[PDB]
Design a protein around this ligand. Structure first.
Ligand SMILES: [Ca+2]
Ligand SMILES: [Ca+2]
Ligand SMILES: [Ca+2]
Ligand SMILES: [Ca+2]
Ligand SMILES: [Mn+2]
Ligand SMILES: [Mn+2]
Ligand SMILES: [Mn+2]
Ligand SMILES: [Mn+2]
Lengths: 236, 236, 236, 236
């Protein structure tokens, strides 16, 4: 069993597993059942942006997701990840489709991580930025149906001639582990941005996209398809 | 009226103006009377580090100040900084001494500010670092007794041959105004770190150091010395 | 007499003053007469990008400017900017029209300056990016006709409801003085990027755009319209 | 085989394989026989700093090695790495001892890489900073004798108590491969800084420290000890 922290952009209401009866963004600690959600209106066919934030002093994980036009939803949860996440983790993006389907396309992705103690110049930091993904992205660990198309976009779930398929899971985790805690740590922070394209010719769509933090050796759990977004073995 | 947000490292208790009866770090919104404080213990002669954070989605301002070897104090405040600051500001450091005194030596200072819209790109961002201040720093607005020394440190309050002077007040602000929000913006964030050296051969010390965010045209208010940290005209 | 280093995007060949007989990019030390040029082909109405690069060890200053679809020109000069620039400077963008005219539109601009010593942690960094300029850009010193427009673009040169005007000059300098050199400095570096739109309804266009490093108090010299790119007084 | 590009801090003159007859820094392209060298004076027991630099427009790889109090040596070489290196690479630090020995201690290491196309915000970027190394650094591929001591330092070659061993080789690579070229790429640059401690009780020391760039799967080649710095299998 992995340890998962996630921000979900949930495109299909699964009210049998605790979803609100609407599309939503959620903060997940160790369970598909979000600790907090906010109503979110998916603009089918438009490029969205999501910004995710945490600081071990504030101890508040927050996310905002908006579309051009200025529709934006936000969600926050007070939590001390310090004592949830292992001291080394990997960061990633995952998506799923089930019976209903959508493209789950990542157009760009940024991440910044900091570990500090007794100075400006802090014991550790990582920063990566993709404003396009290459044909063989060697710094991404691709899981399930995740791959990159020739426009330089990362399709987390299967697409056939631009057209999305049923029951697909995919994940991309950055190759290098991220040092999120130490015994001598004073502050830890991370920031993530990604842009995304949820599209379908149909109007009922599923299942969503998540940004997640996990133990370094995390892999798609068995039976994590559709509503579990490739993150959880069961409907926790 | 200036318009001040500040994190104070308050080395001298003034219980007639709301201080706890002990040394503290605090968070000041428009008043020397802190909206929150935490007990903190100055380690005379030692180099300390302060990390200040804020993100407009979490709306939680927070500070932590550590000394090497594991002692540290943290304080945070829930505040929507949009309610309070102008949308352009200047950021700086200030310190004071009264009857009692201490060096207020800044040894390094970093600041990062981001605006955000709909990309991994930043509608705007600024980042500066100083790990040593030059003898004539044209990018700092020096106010009052603030001056840099021949080690390459910033001595906010007067110093002669090592020994601190009484009744000194001094501030340093970064030359460039920072754009801390636009209504046409999705998220705004800043992060500040500084390392400092508070020292006396005396037994009582005063009055402290602050990181502060003020309107662009801010200057030391009349009678803002001593307990007012060179930030406020009165004790309101 | 201003001290000037510039990278020019020369859109009009003024051969009487040593331009080569075609549109070009140049490296200007202290004079409108570039110490090196390379053929450059302006694509009227397209968004181009320039990247400028310098490192005090390598002592080569270079620039490349490209349009989408693989069209790009590069110029380099071996030079020791130590012995040319003052310790403190300002950085900016300037543009001009003469009889012949063009839009000198800037869409985004970033700069990074580093001074290093004997650390992973630089003695001094500035880094700014603009991906859109606000309508009162309090952190840019605008000179001459330079202003920002309602789409959040910086128009260095006069535009009258869509259409560019003749005999216009305009510069935009970053408010904060940049510390490009110090004597305890082991390395100094900088990089700049800007994207630009050069558009025109006429066949013959002028005069160009330049990025430039100048003494802190630099202003538009007198009679520096047109071929002199708002940069020099004479043509020597 | 491995395709190596390296900057060597060569502490022992092996003149019978091209080394000059003094301690030196050198630029290595695919051979231990440096394409360029400069005389460099090792300071036994002192912390030194290397700054390494490259930019695909300038096509100049340069390194500077300095010690406090004004002792710098610089080397550089005109090369177009574009056509030398693979599209993906790993980056690392290597060192060795032979009969004569030294500590090869890395106190800090940072690295920055960029792939630009046409925006201010580029296609691909990586940056990591270590100002101390963890007890198990999960983001570093440790090879041969490389390991981390309890002071947060990285020991490339074997050291028993405070004492250097004989015939040691060890390397550290960053976990994530680096994207140093793409077909849509317009500019590619990198920058590396590390601080080191070469020390020995005895006067004559060996063999030295390298910053190197290799194909992703690179490991210590057979028989690459001592004078080959754990970089090349032979002295060609
Ligand atoms: Ca769902
Ligand atoms: Ca007080
Ligand atoms: Ca011209
Ligand atoms: Ca040798
Ligand atoms: Mn949900
Ligand atoms: Mn107080
Ligand atoms: Mn010219
Ligand atoms: Mn050699």
């Amino acid at each position: 069993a992995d340890t998962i922290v996630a921000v979900e952009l949930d495109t299909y209401p699964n009210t049998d597993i605790g979803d609100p009866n609407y599309q939503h963004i959620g903060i997940n600690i160790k369970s598909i059942r979000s600790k907090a959600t906010t109503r979110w209106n998916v603009q089918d066919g438009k490029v969205g942006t999501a910004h995710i934030s945490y600081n071990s002093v504030a101890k508040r994980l927050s996310a905002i997701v908006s579309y051009p036009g200025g529709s934006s939803a936000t969600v926050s949860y007070d939590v001390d990840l310090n004592n949830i996440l292992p001291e080394w983790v990997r960061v990633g993006l995952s998506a799923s489709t089930g019976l209903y389907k959508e493209t789950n396309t990542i157009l760009s992705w940024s991440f910044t991580s900091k570990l500090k103690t007794n100075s400006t110049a802090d014991a550790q930091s990582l920063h990566f930025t993709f404003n396009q993904f290459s044909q063989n992205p060697k710094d991404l660990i691709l899981q399930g149906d995740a791959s990159t198309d020739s426009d330089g976009n990362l399709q987390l779930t299967r697409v056939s001639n631009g057209s999305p398929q049923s029951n697909s899971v995919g994940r991309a985790l950055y190759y290098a582990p991220v040092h999120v805690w130490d015994k001598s740590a004073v502050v830890a922070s991370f920031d993530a941005t990604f842009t995304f394209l949820i599209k379908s010719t149909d109007s009922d769509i599923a299942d969503g996209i998540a940004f997640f933090i996990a133990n370094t050796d995390s892999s798609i759990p068995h039976g994590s398809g559709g509503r579990l977004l490739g993150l959880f073995p069961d409907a926790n």
